[PDB]
Structure formats: structure tokens, C-alpha cells
RNA sequence: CAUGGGAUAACAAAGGAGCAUUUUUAAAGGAUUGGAGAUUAUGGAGCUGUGCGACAAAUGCUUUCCUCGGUGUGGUUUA
RNA sequence: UGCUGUUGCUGUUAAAGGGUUCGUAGUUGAACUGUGGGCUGUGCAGG
């Protein structure tokens, strides 16, 4: 994936948070540059995150895989529903 | 895979001599191959040869006169004390009158007659006649 | 004039944990030698000797505190006979290691060699810290146990 | 004297005639020339030698400089050698970096540790490259004659012939002087296909 | 080719004998090193970096201009891949094969090819552990 | 477990050691309290040996970096003096 | 068992960014005779840092990011 | 008796290549660090 390469880029060089609460926190400020959501997200939480992104004018990416796939892609050995990139590093 | 560069070179030379060629390309080359070729040259069994540099293991073009009957490598390179020369000549050479067993010794690579003159043993590399 | 050299130190628990008191047999650790025949860097009384054959006594033997009655440098165990080299194979035992002597054995009929190995149990003094794969020089001594006939003399 | 900054501090006390003349020429060039003005203030030489190539005319001025200036000298070698030749009539100038050679160890453990750039083959290759710098070696052969001798032939690009062929004899003799090895030169007009030019 | 199969293909590069860079290449060595590090910082492995420099910038060989190979430059700058590039690609292929086989349990040909890829991964990991290019206890997880 | 908890609270062992010894205690590695304590002491002794070796390594690193900085600074000074000689 | 030889080999190590200039003088600081052992102190040689002179350095600190002279029967080099 | 074969056997059809791969001990494993030079005399040296 393109998203996999960009994600590993930011895992090495940028900054991010994992989990919906920390993502929404970075969203409530302007620190977030991109929100990545697993296809596994429960509908109401997905909708809340989309609303926050729409209000903050933050780009939203819908991951193909579920929270397990997203967690593995981020190098993590746990699942993550929502990722927020707060510093893009040397990616884009 | 290729495991002995010397055996490959000597088999190539023997094939070219058997089929009556006047030149043969050897690939790859090494120092031991060059010393063996020089030993054969010193006794007139091959003519002039050229080492081509390719920034790798090089290549050799050997000019063949019709004098070489057969050259081959001995694998493994068996130990040979000064008292084993007669046995090797009996086993691998056409006669006691001509032909050479080539050895690697701590005095360098040479044929068996020169080594016996220096009173040194070593490992058997091959033969030619 | 002897009681003027008597000096009492305290028992340190890093050594004395055997239910019997650990001490060198060759010296009296309570009395200071007037001539400093057996004294370490820190003034403690410690016996040490030079084994022959040009083997240097390790600094930890001269100046350490370990008690080992089988150490060739600080006890009456002496080195005589064979000096062998080997690779350390196991360090699982207390003060004893297993070494391997790998060698080629020639079969005359086939004019070829065979890989063979022997294993020797060796006493290792606390003056050395050998690891698996290290090279060691060992020297033959009197029997120290059912299998041990050698002592570690140097760790490469 | 201002011009002696262009030598090693060792030779500034009692400079030889040729070393002082080369230092003077380098000092004047460090101001007159525009391309040599950008590099020469950091550059200085070790020694200068005269070599008389036999059976010919003209001598060869061998200028020795520290190896740390290799890139500096490479960057302006074509200008520097031409200007120095314009200074000395009837003499060729060849700039050779001073290189140290680590003799081949007799032990397999020391042999594994020697700096490969301090081996004889690498050093001799680099010295010959210095001698002919603007041209590069296009091929290399060793001719092994029936008498046990080995003769090395170095091939250059035939499009460079009109600039180097006249110097090739002096280069061969000076390479023999410095390395105690023989070298012969040939030209190839199609190096990719090993096409040797007969003239 | 030869390892794991009957392929005998010969296709490869033939590096030039004349190693000196062309005279029309007027990019200094330090600028080339900067380009290499910038490419690595955009998540490019040494193979891809070399290919961009060769296709778009006229740098036939980085080592011939700078004196150093690309992975050496990345190591000197802290940009080298955490695990070696070829092992990374083999692990990625094995993972994709396993993902495909999760749904396609009767694709026996892919199971055969997965066995070959994993044996390759173990032989390479053994090599890289021996030359201290990997940690001990580095484990390939299926 | 009560012993391991008390040792963690008093900082006698760190989290990694606590977790390892906890999983080994559940796995019937220690026969009694004194066995666990002796294993803890052995861990601490090996840790002290490693720490001493690493402290020597760090001292060499500091000394070598200092010598390097001094050599570089002296070379810069001498080059400046040579330039001022011109 | 001792020793000469080093060509062919083996063992071990490394995996090349944990890889790091020779000296001079100066100041600043922290065992030996002495009649011989003892004791008890000076006085040093011998440790870092501050200067200074003299060399070097396998890679440039004067850096790197902020028509004419020479050459073989035209070719370079400035113009 | 080269019908036990290291020297030194046989394996398409006479006896004998495992159905095919993978693979651990084992065995085996590519180049490279390297032409010493001058002086005189002497040799069917040779182009
Ligand atoms: Mg039969
Ligand atoms: Mg059959
Ligand atoms: Mg048959
Ligand atoms: Mg049959
Ligand atoms: Mg079957
Ligand atoms: Mg296999």
C-alpha cells in the first residue's frame, strides 16, 4: 500500500498517537494532520471521528484492513482503531 | 558449482590439445593456475600465454603447440614426502623418461624433479606430459 | 615478637558462605608477615606462587580474595606433564568447565582425514572468566575429582 | 619568503634548486592563474626530482606531493602540469602523490588487517594513474613469454593518443624508476570490443 | 534463479571496466551523498535510490563518484534499514502469501512456494546473524 | 508473590526482573522463599558485574571524545597561526 | 618432543562510523643514597589541565552547509 | 579377484538413481594483498 509506506515513514520519522481518545484530543487542537480509521470501527465512533475531522478540516483516510491490520502496519503488536498523525515527518 | 579453478583450467587445456586447437581461453584464472602454466612453459609444453584483466578473476589465452599430450589436476592435493615421488611417477606418469608431476611446496610451486633436487615435499597439484 | 604482627580483619560474606570457614592453608591470615612474603595490593595476607613454564600469575590471584584450594596459583596444586590447548565447551559447573579438543584423524587406507573430538573436564580458578567458544591453555595436575585432571592456566 | 608556503616545512630550511624553482612557479601561479587560484593556497609539495629518460631528449620533472591533496591535484591537474611545463622548457612535469606501502605480511592474521590501498598493486596502479591522469586505463594484459618473463601492457583510449603518445616513453621510464616494474602502452579505438588500434 | 528451482537465467548488469565518472557529470560528491540521504529520508531503500539516481540524474554508479556504496552512506547517516533490504522483501512476500492462503486453503502451489520462501528467509537470517547484521534471537514469525 | 511484590515496591528489582521472576514462580522454578531470594541475589551480582564493565567502557568513550576535541581544537589553532604567519 | 620453510590449506576474529599524531620546553595544580636497620619529614623523579615551540597526517580549515609561452610532426594552456 | 574398487568397480537395456522437493549434522566450496632492482663477465637466448 501507499498508506503502508507513508505510515512506516511516520513511524520512523514523524509523530502520531494511537487510539480514539488521544486522536480526538489532537483533533480538538490543530496538531493533527491526518486521521486513519480501520474498517472495523463501530459506526457511532467512526461517525464521531468523521465529524471532528470535518470540523477541523483534517484529512481522513479509511484504512482497508481492520484494527488488527492497522496495528500490524504500524509495527505494533496490538490493535488500533484510530491513528492520528500529528507530525508528518519526512513523508508528504 | 565450480569448486576447483585449477582442475577446470587443466581440463580445458587438455580438451583443446586433444581436439588439436592452437589457442584456448581459460576462465576464471588465479595465481596457482598461472604458476602451473609457467611450469608447463618452462619445459616447452605450451607456448606463449596472455592474462586478460577484467577487474575480476581474469581470463587466460594460452597458445598451444602440439607437444602437450595430457594435463590434469590431482584432487585432493595429497601430501607427498620426498620418498613418495617414485610412487607418484609410477602411478600417474607415462614413463620415467619424461612427464612431470607438479607440486605446491613451501619453496613454491614446481615440478617433481626440481622439488626432489631441493629436497622438499608438499602437496600434489597435477601432472602433464 | 610474634604478637606484634597480629591483625584482625572482619569476615566478609561474599566469600564466607560454605558452613565451614574458607581460608588458605599455606598462610595464617591473622598475622602480617614482617617481610611481606605473601601480601596483595591492599595489604591483605594472600599466598601465591609462580607456576613454572613461563605462565604469568593473574593479577586477580595476587590481589583478589577468592579462596580456591584447587587453584594452581594460590594452592598446593602443581602443574606438571602435558600442556594442552582447547576450546571451552560448557561452563555449567561450579569451578569446572568442559573443553573440546578438535582434531583430524588420518585413516591410512583411504589417505584421508576424519573429524574427531575429545572432551576434558577442567578445574577453572575464579581468577579466570572463560566463556563458551573461548580458547584456553590447560596444564595437567594430580586428580582433583573423578574426571578432572587439568587446570585452566590462561584464557585467550 | 612568501613562496615557501608551497613546500613542506622540512624543506624550507635548505631548499634544493629544483624544489625552490617549483615553489616559486607555484607561488606565481597561485596569483596569475584563475583556475589554479581556487586550489593552490591549500596545496604544497614534498620534493622535486629530475629524471633523464635514456635514448631521448628532455628530462622529466617528478613533483611529489602529499596524498591528502589527491582530490585537489586531480581537480586542476591538466592546468597545473601545462603551466609548469610552460615554465620549464624542454622538460615534462608529472605530479605523483606520495604513497606508503605495507609490505606483505608473512602471517595470515596480519595479512587480513593491512589497508588494501597500501598494497603494492594498488599503490603502483594509482601511481601509474597519476602519471597519465587525464587518460584512464582502458585495459590491462600480462604477456607471459616462453622465457618465464611477464610483461604488462596498459591500454589507453585511442582518442587520447594525440595528447599522450609523445609522453608515453617518459612515463614508462619514470614508472620503472619509481615502481621498479615494467609497463608497455597500447591504444584501443573500441575499448568495449577490445579493438586495438594498429596506429 | 538457481536456488529453489530449475531456473538458469543469466540476466544481470555488466559493470564497466573504466570506473572513472564521465566528464560531463558535474555533480560534486557531497551533493550526491546529500541526494542519497534525502532519498532515504523519503523511505527509499538503496536499490530504489540507486535506480532513481541512474535514471534521472546521470549517476551510473554512486560508488564511482563518491567512493562509497549507498548502504554505507546510509549507515554513516543513521538511515540504513533496521533489517536488511532483501530480508525485508522476502518477509513481505511470505506475509502476503500467508494472507492469501488464509482464504485459499487449497492453493497447494502457493503452499509449496511459501515453503521455498521461508527456507530462503531462514538461510538469509542465518547469514545475517552470523555477520552481526541482525540481533541474536531475531525470529521470523509466520 | 508477596515477596516479589515487596521487592518491587522497595526498588530492589526493576519491572523486567519482577515480570520474569513472576512468570517463573508461577512455573514452579523456585522451591521456597530462600531459593527465590538466592536467584535474586545471583541476578543482582551479574547486573553489578555488567554495570562495572559498561562504566569502564563509558569512561573510555568520554576520554577518547575529549582527546579528539582537544586534537581538533589544536589543529584549528595551529592552522590559524600559520595563516597569520603569511 | 625441538626446530627450519610458507606455497596449498584449516582454526579463530572482523562485517569495516565504538571507528580516535609524534615531539620540545615551561610554569599551575594533585624507591635510592645520605653510617646501617628502624621512625619521622623535606626534596624530588613519576599524573591531568594551561601555554609554547618543532614534525607530520590515507585524503583539501585560506574548506563545507549558514596571441602567447611548452610539446610531436596539430594537441594542451592561458588568450 | 578392478567379484568390496583410496589407489581401483558397476547402476539406459545385464544387479543397481530414492516419485518429487525442502532440510540439519556431514562433506565440498570463486578471485584478490605477491613479477625486487642495478653492475661486470658468461651462454646455438630470441626477435
Ligand atoms: Mg562388476
Ligand atoms: Mg539402472
Ligand atoms: Mg543398466
Ligand atoms: Mg535392471
Ligand atoms: Mg517415496
Ligand atoms: Mg538445501
Phi, psi of A30 (to 5 degrees): -95, 15
Q: What are the cell numbers at E39? A: 532519498
CB nearest to D139's CB, from B37, B38, B53: B53
User: How far apart (Å, rounded) are the C-alpha atoms in residues E141 and F6?
Assistant: 37
Pairing of strands B108-111, B100-105: antiparallel
Using CA atoms, how far residue A24 sits from A33, A88, B98, in Å, is: 12, 17, 94
Give chain B's domain count. 2
- Residue D174's closest CA among D104, D101, D91? D91
Give the Cα separation of C94 and C108 in Å (integer): 42
The values of phi and psi at residue D88, to 5°, are -95, 110
CA E138 to ligand 6 center in whole angstroms: 22
Q: Return phi, psi of residue E10, to 5°.
A: -110, 0
In chain D, what are the helix, strand and coil shares in percent, each to the nearest 5? 45, 25, 30
**B18, B44, B68 - which closes a domain:** B68
Q: What is the rounded CA–CA span in Å between residue A65 and residue A68?
A: 8
Residue E136 CB neighbour total at 10 angstroms:
6
Closest residue in chain B to residue E18, using alpha carbons only: B55
Length of chain F: 86
Bond from prior residue into D197 cis (ω within 30 degrees of 0) = no
Sequence-distant (6+) residues with CB within 8 A of D166 are none
Report the distance separating Cα F24 and Cα B53, nearest Å: 64
- The CATH number of residue B88's host domain is 3.30.1490.10
Please tell me the number of Cα atoms within 13 Å of E21 on its side-chain side. Answer: 20
Rounded Cα–Cα distance for residues A46 and A48 (Å): 6
| Sheet order of strands, A82-87 included | A15-18, A82-87, A34-37, A60-62
Distance between CA atoms of residues F43 and F18, nearest Å: 11
Q: d(Cα C140, Cα C138) in Å, to the nearest integer?
A: 7
- Strand H footprint nucleotides (protein C-beta < 7 Å): 6-8, 21-24, 26-38
Q: Which of A5, A8, A90 sits opposite E41 (nearest CB)?
A: A90
Is the bond into B76 cis (omega within 30 degrees of 0)?
A: yes
Residue B22's domain comprises: 1-68
Answer yes or no: do A13 and E41 touch at CB < 8 A: yes
**Contact list, D139 vs chain B (CB under 8 Å):** 53
Give the CA count within 13 Å in the CB-facing half-sphere of B106: 6
Helix (H, G, I), strand (E, B) or coil at D69: helix
Give chain A positions within 8 Å (CB) of E99: none
Q: Are residues B99 and B115 in the same domain?
A: yes
State the pairing for strand pair B59-63/B49-52: antiparallel
My answer on whether B63 and B19 are in the same domain is yes
What is the distance between the alpha carbons of residues E64 and E21, in angstroms, rounded to a whole number?
6
Is the torsion defined by CA of D107, D110, D113, D116 positive or negative? negative
Report the neighbours of D using a cutoff of 3 or more CB pairs below 8 angstroms: B, E
Q: Is E42 on the interface with A (CB under 8 A)?
A: yes
Task: Count Cβ atoms below 10 Å from residue D155 Cβ, excluding itself.
Answer: 20
Helix/strand/coil (H/E/C) assignment for every residue in C4-64: HHECCCCCCCCCCCCCCCCCCCCCCCCECCCCCCCECCCCCECCCCCCCCCCCCCHHHHHC
| Polymer length of chain C | 156
Adjacent-strand bridge partners of C122: C97, C150
F21's CB contacts (< 8 A; 6+ apart) are: F4, F13, F36, F39, F40
Helix (H, G, I), strand (E, B) or coil at B59: strand
Alpha helices in chain F (DSSP H): 2-9, 15-26, 33-85
List of residues 6+ apart from D35 with CB closer than 8 A: D76, D79
C47 in Cβ contact with C38 (< 8 Å): yes
- What resolution in angstroms does the PDB record give? 2.4
Grid-cell match 600480462, residue found: D142
CA D41 to chain centre: 21
Q: Is B67 exposed, middle or buried (0-12, 13-18, 19+ CB in 10 A)?
A: middle
CB-CB contact of B38 with D144 (8 Å): yes
Distance, CA of C42 to C1' of G42, in Å? 27
Q: Does B25 touch chain D (CB under 8 A)?
A: no
Among D93, D91, D97, D41, residue whose Cα is nearest residue D66: D97
What's chain F's Rg over C-alpha atoms? 25
Tell whether B19 and B57 lie within a shared domain: yes
Instruction: Looking at the structure, tell me whether residues B95 and B59 fall in a common domain.
Output: no
CATH number of the domain that residue B51 is part of: 3.30.1370.30
Q: List the 131-190 stretch of D: residues with Cβ below 8 A of B.
A: 139-146, 148
Q: For chain E, what's the residue count?
A: 142
Q: Strand D47-52: give its sheet, edge to edge.
A: D47-52, D59-66, D91-98
Q: Of all protein residues, which has its CA closest to the C1' atom of G72?
A: D166
Backbone angles phi, psi at C46, to 5 degrees: -150, 120
* A67 touches A79 (CB < 8 A): yes
C-alpha cell at D46: 614534498
Closest chain E residue to B55, measured at CA: E17
Q: Distance (Å, rounded) from C-alpha F4 to C-alpha F40? A: 10
Q: How far is the CA of D111 from the C1' of G6 (A)?
A: 13
Among D104, D137, D139, D142, the residue to mutate for chain B (most B Cβ within 10 A)? D142
Contact criterion met (CB < 8 Å) for B48 and D148 = no
In chain D, alpha helices (H): 17-32, 70-75, 77-87, 108-111, 120-131, 161-179
Q: What are phi and psi of B84, to 5 degrees?
A: -95, -5
Three-state secondary structure call for residue D156? strand
**Shared-domain flag, residues B86 and B104:** yes
What is each CA distance from D188 to D41, D158, D192, E95, in whole angstroms?
39, 5, 9, 53
Residue C136 half-sphere exposure toward CB, CA atoms < 13 A: 31
Q: Which residues of E touch A90 (CB under 8 A)?
A: 41-43
Q: How far is E18 from chain D (nearest CA, A)?
A: 6
Residues 6+ apart with CB under 8 A from D21: D48, D88
Judging contacts by C-beta atoms under 8 Å, the chain D residues touching residue E20 are: 136
End residue of a domain, out of B21, B43, B68: B68
- DSSP for D27-59 reads HHHHHH-SSTTTTGGG--BSEEEEEE-SSSS-E
Distance of CA E1 to the CA centre of its chain: 16
> Which segments within chain A are labelled E, that is strand?
15-18, 34-37, 60-62, 82-87
Q: How far apart are CA D40 and CA D30, in angstroms?
A: 6
Pairing of strands B100-105, D195-196: unpaired
Chain B contact set for D144 (CB, 8 A): 34, 37-38, 41, 48-51
Residue of chain B whose Cα is closest to the Cα of E19: B55
Q: Three-state DSSP class for A83?
A: strand
Q: Which ligand is nearest to the CA of E2?
A: 6
Q: What is the distance between the alpha carbons of residues B68 and E126, in angstroms, rounded to a whole number?
A: 48
Chain A residues in contact with chain E using a Cβ-Cβ cutoff of 8 Å: 5-6, 8-9, 12-13, 90-91
Distance in Å from H12's C1' to D10's CA comes to 83
- Is residue B101 within 8 A of residue B46, CB to CB? The reply is no
Residues B24 and B58 in one domain: yes
Measured between alpha carbons, how far is B105 from B119 in angstroms, rounded to an integer? Answer: 10
Reduced to 3 states (helix: H, G, I; strand: E, B; else coil), residue D83 is: helix
Same domain, yes or no, for B1 and B64? Answer: yes
Q: How far is the CA of C83 from the C1' of G1 (A)?
A: 12
DSSP secondary structure letter of residue B53:
P
Per the DSSP assignment, residues forming a β-bridge with B39 are: none
Is residue E110 helix, strand or coil? helix
B128 shares a domain with B112: yes
Experimental approach taken? cryo-EM
Whether C and D touch (3+ CB pairs < 8 Å), yes or no: no
Place of cell 577484467: B54
Q: Among residues B68, B87, B117, which one ends one of the domains?
A: B68
Q: Are residues B79 and B123 in the same domain?
A: yes
Q: What are the residues facing D60 on neighbouring strands?
A: D51, D92
Does residue B91 sit in the same domain as residue B80? yes
Contacts of F79 (CB under 8 A, 6+ apart): none
User: Are B63 and B73 found together in one domain?
Assistant: no
Q: Which of B1, B54, B55, B56 to mutate to test the interface with E (most CBs of E within 10 A)?
A: B55
Burial class of residue D98 in the structure, from the number of CB atoms within 10 Å of its CB (0-12 exposed, 13-18 middle, 19+ buried): middle
F3-28 burial by CB neighbour count: b if 16+ within 10 A, else e? ebeebbeeeebeeebbeebeeeeeee
Pairing status of strand D195-196 against strand D150-157: unpaired
Residues B74 and B37 in one domain: no
Farthest-apart Cα atoms in chain D, separation: 59
Residue with cell 492462503: E101
CB atoms within 10 A of CB D141: 20
Query: Which of A12, A65, A72 should we substitute to test contact with E (largest number of E Cβ atoms within 10 Å)?
Result: A12
Amino acid at each position: 500500500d501507499t498508506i503502508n509506506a507513508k505510515l512506516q515513514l511516520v513511524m520512523k520519522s514523524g509523530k502520531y498517537v494511537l487510539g480514539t481518545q488521544q486522536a480526538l484530543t489532537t483533533l480538538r487542537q490543530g496538531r493533527s494532520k491526518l486521521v486513519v480509521i480501520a474498517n472495523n470501527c463501530p459506526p457511532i465512533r467512526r461517525a464521531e471521528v468523521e465529524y471532528y475531522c470535518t470540523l477541523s478540516k483534517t484529512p481522513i483516510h479509511h484504512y482497508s484492513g481492520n484494527n488488527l491490520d492497522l496495528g500490524t502496519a504500524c509495527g505494533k503488536h496490538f490493535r488500533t482503531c484510530v491513528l492520528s498523525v500529528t507530525n508528518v515527518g519526512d513523508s508528504d | 558449482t565450480m569448486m576447483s579453478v585449477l582442475a577446470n583450467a587443466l581440463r580445458t587445456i587438455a580438451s583443446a590439445e586433444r581436439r588439436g586447437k592452437r589457442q584456448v581461453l581459460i576462465r576464471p584464472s588465479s595465481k596457482v593456475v598461472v604458476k602451473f602454466l609457467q611450469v608447463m612453459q618452462k619445459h616447452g609444453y605450451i607456448g606463449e600465454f596472455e592474462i586478460i584483466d577484467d577487474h575480476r578473476a581474469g581470463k587466460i589465452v594460452v597458445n598451444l603447440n602440439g607437444r602437450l599430450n595430457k594435463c590434469g589436476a590431482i584432487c585432493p592435493r595429497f601430501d607427498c614426502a620426498t620418498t613418495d615421488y617414485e610412487k607418484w611417477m609410477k602411478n600417474i606418469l607415462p614413463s620415467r623418461q619424461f612427464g612431470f608431476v607438479v607440486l605446491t611446496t613451501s619453496l613454491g610451486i614446481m615440478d617433481h624433479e626440481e622439488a626432489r633436487s631441493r629436497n622438499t615435499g608438499g602437496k600434489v597439484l597435477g601432472f602433464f606430459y | 615478637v610474634a604478637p606484634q604482627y597480629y591483625h584482625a580483619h572482619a569476615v566478609d560474606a561474599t566469600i564466607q558462605h560454605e558452613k565451614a570457614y574458607q581460608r588458605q592453608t599455606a598462610v595464617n591470615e591473622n598475622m602480617h608477615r614482617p617481610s611481606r612474603k605473601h601480601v596483595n595490593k591492599s595489604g591483605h595476607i594472600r599466598y601465591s606462587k609462580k607456576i613454572g613454564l613461563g605462565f604469568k600469575t593473574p593479577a586477580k590471584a595476587l590481589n583478589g580474595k577468592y579462596i580456591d584450594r584447587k587453584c594452581p596459583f594460590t594452592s598446593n596444586v602443581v602443574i606438571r606433564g602435558r600442556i594442552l590447548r582447547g576450546v571451552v565447551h560448557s561452563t555449567k559447573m561450579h569451578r569446572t568447565i568442559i573443553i573440546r579438543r578438535n582434531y583430524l584423524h588420518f585413516i591410512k587406507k583411504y589417505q584421508r582425514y576424519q573429524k574427531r573430538h575429545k572432551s576434558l573436564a577442567v578445574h577453572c580458578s575464579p581468577a579466570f572468566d572463560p566463556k563458551q567458544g573461548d580458547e584456553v591453555v590447560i596444564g595437567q595436575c594430580r586428580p582433583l575429582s573423578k574426571t578432572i585432571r587439568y587446570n585452566v592456566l590462561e584464557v585467550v | 619568503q612568501p613562496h615557501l608556503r608551497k613546500l613542506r616545512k622540512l624543506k624550507r630550511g635548505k631548499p634544493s634548486d629544483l624544489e625552490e624553482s617549483v615553489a616559486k612557479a607555484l607561488f606565481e601561479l597561485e596569483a596569475s592563474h584563475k583556475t589554479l587560484r581556487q586550489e593552490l593556497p591549500r596545496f604544497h609539495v614534498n620534493t622535486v626530482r629530475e629524471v633523464k629518460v635514456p635514448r631521448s631528449k628532455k628530462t622529466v620533472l617528478v613533483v611529489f606531493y602529499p596524498l591528502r591533496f589527491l582530490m585537489l591535484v586531480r581537480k586542476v591537474q591538466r592546468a597545473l602540469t601545462s603551466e609548469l611545463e610552460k615554465r620549464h622548457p624542454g622538460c615534462l612535469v608529472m605530479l605523483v602523490a606520495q604513497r606508503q606501502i605495507t609490505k606483505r605480511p608473512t602471517d595470515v592474521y596480519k595479512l587480513q588487517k593491512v589497508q588494501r590501498s597500501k598494497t603494492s598493486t594498488a599503490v603502483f596502479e594509482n601511481i601509474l594513474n597519476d602519471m597519465i591522469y587525464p587518460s584512464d586505463v582502458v585495459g590491462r594484459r600480462w604477456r607471459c613469454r616462453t622465457d618465464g618473463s611477464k610483461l604488462m601492457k596498459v591500454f589507453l583510449d585511442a582518442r587520447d593518443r594525440k595528447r599522450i603518445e609523445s609522453r608515453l616513453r617518459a612515463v614508462a621510464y619514470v614508472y620503472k624508476q619509481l615502481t621498479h616494474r615494467r609497463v608497455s602502452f597500447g591504444f584501443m579505438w573500441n575499448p568495449k570490443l577490445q579493438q586495438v588500434s594498429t596506429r | 534463479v538457481r536456488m529453489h528451482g530449475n531456473g538458469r537465467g543469466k540476466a544481470s548488469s555488466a559493470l564497466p571496466y573504466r570506473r572513472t565518472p564521465p566528464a560531463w557529470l558535474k555533480i560534486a560528491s557531497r551533493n550526491v551523498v546529500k541526494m542519497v540521504c534525502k532519498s532515504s529520508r523519503k523511505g527509499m531503500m538503496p536499490s530504489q535510490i540507486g535506480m532513481e539516481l541512474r535514471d534521472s540524474m546521470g549517476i551510473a554508479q554512486v560508488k564511482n563518484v563518491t567512493g562509497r556504496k549507498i548502504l554505507r552512506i546510509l549507515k554513516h547517516n543513521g538511515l540504513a534499514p533496521e533489517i536488511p533490504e532483501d530480508l525485508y522483501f522476502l518477509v513481505k512476500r511470505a506475509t502476503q502469501m500467508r494472507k492469501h492462503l488464509e482464504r485459499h486453503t487449497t492453493d497447494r502451489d502457493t503452499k509449496y512456494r511459501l515453503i521455498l520462501v521461508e527456507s530462503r528467509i531462514h538461510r538469509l537470517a542465518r547469514y545475517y546473524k552470523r555477520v552481526k547484521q541482525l540481533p541474536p534471537t531475531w525470529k521470523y514469525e509466520s | 508473590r508477596r515477596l516479589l511484590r515487596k521487592y518491587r515496591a522497595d526498588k530492589k528489582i526493576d519491572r523486567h526482573v519482577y515480570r520474569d521472576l513472576y512468570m517463573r514462580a508461577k512455573g514452579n522454578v523456585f522451591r521456597n522463599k530462600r531459593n527465590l531470594v538466592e536467584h535474586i541475589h545471583k541476578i543482582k551480582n551479574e547486573k553489578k558485574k555488567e554495570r562495572q564493565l559498561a562504566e569502564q567502557l563509558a569512561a573510555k568513550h568520554l576520554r577518547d571524545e575529549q582527546n579528539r576535541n582537544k586534537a581538533r581544537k589544536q589543529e584549528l589553532k595551529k592552522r590559524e597561526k600559520e595563516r597569520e604567519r603569511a
